[PDB]
């Protein structure tokens, strides 16, 4: 469990690696993998689609069942579901959809959900299709998360820009 390796330490509790979060989950066997979700847990692409594909669609079946019973999440909110074959648990976190006008301050609330877990494998919330500036998402993560977060950044150019901008 939690076999993290090859990360660059950014702060006392935030680590970063240029990697596909799916390949990391398979190597690391984390207690918790974070999904960058929407409020309906419809895992249509990005991190969410990659995680769902790696669970052979079991994540989407489980998510549909949960939402049908319980209703949508709130923006900035989260829910723990099974991690299936990738992790013990998946923490589905809804960052704000900045491009659609949702309040970017909810990125703080989104990252605050990480603090209920001692160690997490995670992506940069809202930094893809939701349109938040990745450097900003990293800054909010560093300022908000107090537990141990291992960030997987798939794109090499972005990873280099994030590490350069942080260094
Ligand atoms: C389309 O629907 C989905 O996207 C919506 C949520 O959008 P988001 O902006 O919060 O998250 P996204 O996943 O787009 O990117 C977050 C960050 O992870 C990077 N990245 C992408 N794939 C990655 C991978 N396999 N491994 C590591 N890093 C990855 C991105 O380059 C970006 O920096 C929601 O509706 C959801 O169902």
CATH number for the domain spanning 115: value is: 3.40.220.10
Ligand 1 centroid, distance to 45 Cα (angstroms): 7
81 bridge partner residues: 90
Has residue 131 been placed in a domain? yes
Half-sphere exposure of 127 (CA within 13 A, CB side): 24
**C-alpha–C-alpha distance, residues 144 and 123, integer Å:** 15
In a domain, 82, yes or no: yes
Q: Note down the domain range covering 166.
A: 8-167
Helix (H, G, I), strand (E, B) or coil at 139: helix
Contact 79, 112 (CB under 8 A): no
Mutate to test the pocket of ligand 1, among 18, 38, 40, 47 (most ligand atoms within 8 A of CB): 47
Residues 117/31, Cβ–Cβ less than 8 Å: yes
- Kindly state whether residue 85 falls inside one of the protein's structural domains: yes
Long-range pairs for 58-67 at CB < 8 Å and ≥24 separation?
A: 58/82, 58/84, 58/85, 59/35, 59/84, 59/90, 63/92, 66/41, 67/40, 67/41
Dist. CA 119 → ligand 1 center (Å): 20
**d(C-alpha 96, C-alpha 42), whole Å:** 15
Q: Based on the number of CB atoms within 10 Å of its own CB, is 135 exposed (0-12), middle (13-18) or buried (19 or more)?
A: middle
- Give one DSSP letter per residue of 10-51, joined into a string: -SSSEEEEES-HHHHHHHH--SEEEEEE-TT----SHHHHHH
* Nearest by Cα to 47 from 15, 103, 91: 91
Q: At what angle do helices 134-144 and 156-166 cross, to 10 degrees?
A: 50
The method of structure determination was X-ray
Q: What's the burial of 3, exposed, middle or buried (CB within 10 Å: 0-12/13-18/19+)?
A: exposed
Q: To one decimal place, what's the resolution in Å?
A: 1.6
Closest C-alpha to 76, from 109, 99, 101: 109
Angle at Cα 39 formed by Cα 35 and Cα 45, nearest 5°? 50
Number of domains in the chain: 1
Cβ neighbours, 10 Å, residue 68: 8
Asked, for residue 1, whether it belongs to a domain, the answer is no
Ligand 1 is surrounded, with C-beta below 6 A, by 20-22, 36-38, 42-48, 50, 95, 123-130, 134, 152-155
């Amino acid at each position: 469990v939690n076999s993290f390796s090859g990360y660059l330490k950014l702060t006392d509790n935030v680590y970063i690696k240029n990697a596909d979060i799916v390949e990391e989950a398979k190597k690391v066997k984390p207690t918790v993998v974070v999904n960058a979700a929407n409020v309906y847990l419809k895992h249509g692409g990005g991190v969410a689609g990659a995680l769902n594909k790696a669970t052979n669609n079991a994540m989407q079946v489980e998510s549909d069942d949960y939402i049908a019973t319980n209703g949508p999440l709130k923006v900035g909110g989260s829910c723990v579901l099974s991690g299936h074959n990738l992790a013990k648990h998946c923490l589905h976190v809804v960052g704000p959809n900045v491009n659609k006008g949702e309040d970017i301050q909810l990125l703080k609330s989104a990252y605050e959900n990480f603090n209920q877990h001692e160690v997490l494998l995670a992506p940069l919330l809202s930094a893809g299709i939701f349109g938040a500036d990745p450097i900003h998402s990293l800054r909010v993560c560093v300022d908000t998360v107090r537990t141990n977060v291992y960030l997987a950044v798939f794109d090499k150019n972005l990873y280099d820009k994030l590490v350069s901008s942080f260094l």
